[PDB]
Write a protein that binds this ligand. Structure first.
Ligand SMILES: Cc1cc2nc3c(=O)[nH]c(=O)nc-3n(C[C@H](O)[C@H](O)[C@H](O)COP(=O)(O)O)c2cc1C
Length: 138
């Protein structure tokens, strides 16, 4: 499987590592890729797309790297299964509700409830691991 993410201070990156750990513990293989290093064509061969990005201003996806990537793959992912995650600061997850609505609008099947954690995982570490374990049971 593959996990693609954008992280500005490392919070979503940490989430990505933990989710990967959960998938690996379930017996499966997975590679985490920062959005800057992604290859669209190889990504599109995946059964499940696990995408993460923190909440940027104001309650939107990061604009210089992540959004352009989402827009680029938007027309080629109808019918694909996707799982979403990301870290946020002071909001209540509005950016994630919009992210889910957007992927559904592109014809994707959002497989699990999006995983959102405030700031660095720390306390929510097992939660991140368990989310990966859920995706591995798909
Ligand atoms: C310019 C900027 C805008 C932000 N806007 C929001 C926002 O609208 N809502 C929110 O809850 N957090 C917001 N945050 C906080 C980040 O989502 C939060 O610090 C998160 O933990 C960052 O994770 P990352 O290290 O993976 O980027 C913003 C942070 C920055 C730098």
């Amino acid at each position: 499987m593959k996990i693609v993410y954008w992280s500005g201070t490392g919070n979503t990156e940490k989430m990505a590592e933990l989710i990967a750990k959960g998938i690996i513990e379930s017996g499966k293989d997975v590679n985490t890729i920062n959005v800057s290093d992604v290859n669209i064509d190889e990504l599109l061969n995946e059964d499940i797309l696990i995408l993460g990005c923190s909440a940027m201003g104001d309650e939107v996806l990061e604009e210089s790297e992540f959004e352009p990537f989402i827009e680029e793959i938007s027309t080629k992912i109808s019918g694909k299964k996707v799982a979403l995650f990301g870290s946020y600061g002071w909001g209540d997850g509005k950016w994630m509700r919009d992210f889910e609505e957007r992927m559904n609008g592109y014809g994707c099947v959002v497989v699990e409830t999006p995983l959102i954690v405030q700031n660095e995982p720390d306390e929510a570490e097992q939660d991140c691991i368990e989310f990966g374990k859920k995706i591995a049971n798909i």
